[PDB]
Design a protein around this motif. Structure first.
Motif, PDB file in Angstrom:
ATOM      1  N   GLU A 174       0.859  -1.217   0.000  1.00  0.00           N
ATOM      2  CA  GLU A 174       0.000   0.000   0.000  1.00  0.00           C
ATOM      3  C   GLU A 174       0.885   1.253   0.000  1.00  0.00           C
ATOM      4  N   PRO A 175       0.731   2.053  -1.026  1.00  0.00           N
ATOM      5  CA  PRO A 175       1.551   3.284  -1.097  1.00  0.00           C
ATOM      6  C   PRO A 175       0.745   4.490  -0.602  1.00  0.00           C
ATOM      7  N   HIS A 176      -0.510   4.566  -0.956  1.00  0.00           N
ATOM      8  CA  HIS A 176      -1.346   5.715  -0.508  1.00  0.00           C
ATOM      9  C   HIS A 176      -1.447   5.706   1.018  1.00  0.00           C
ATOM     10  N   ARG A 177      -1.125   4.602   1.631  1.00  0.00           N
ATOM     11  CA  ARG A 177      -1.199   4.522   3.114  1.00  0.00           C
ATOM     12  C   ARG A 177       0.217   4.428   3.679  1.00  0.00           C
ATOM     13  N   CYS A 178       0.400   4.768   4.923  1.00  0.00           N
ATOM     14  CA  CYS A 178       1.768   4.703   5.505  1.00  0.00           C
ATOM     15  C   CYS A 178       1.714   4.153   6.929  1.00  0.00           C
ATOM     16  N   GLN A 179       2.856   3.981   7.535  1.00  0.00           N
ATOM     17  CA  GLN A 179       2.894   3.455   8.927  1.00  0.00           C
ATOM     18  C   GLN A 179       3.941   4.230   9.730  1.00  0.00           C
ATOM     19  N   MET A 180       4.268   5.418   9.299  1.00  0.00           N
ATOM     20  CA  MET A 180       5.281   6.230  10.033  1.00  0.00           C
ATOM     21  C   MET A 180       6.623   5.494  10.039  1.00  0.00           C
ATOM     22  N   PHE A 181       7.655   6.119   9.540  1.00  0.00           N
ATOM     23  CA  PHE A 181       8.991   5.457   9.518  1.00  0.00           C
ATOM     24  C   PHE A 181       9.383   5.052  10.940  1.00  0.00           C
TER      25      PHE A 181
END
Length: 44
Positions: A37-44
């Protein structure tokens, strides 16, 4: 924007019409877009 980032392909920061293998909606600055998922993230 005061109403959904790109409002259209569900995003959470910027917009990238067809982000490589996606459909608009990028990650952000300090956010690693999950592999599935690119449009979504998980904070580095």
């Amino acid at each position: 924007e005061p109403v959904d980032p790109c409002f259209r392909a569900n995003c959470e920061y910027q917009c990238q019409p067809l982000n490589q293998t996606s459909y608009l909606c990028v990650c952000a600055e300090g956010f690693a877009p999950i592999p599935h998922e690119p449009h979504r993230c998980q904070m580095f």
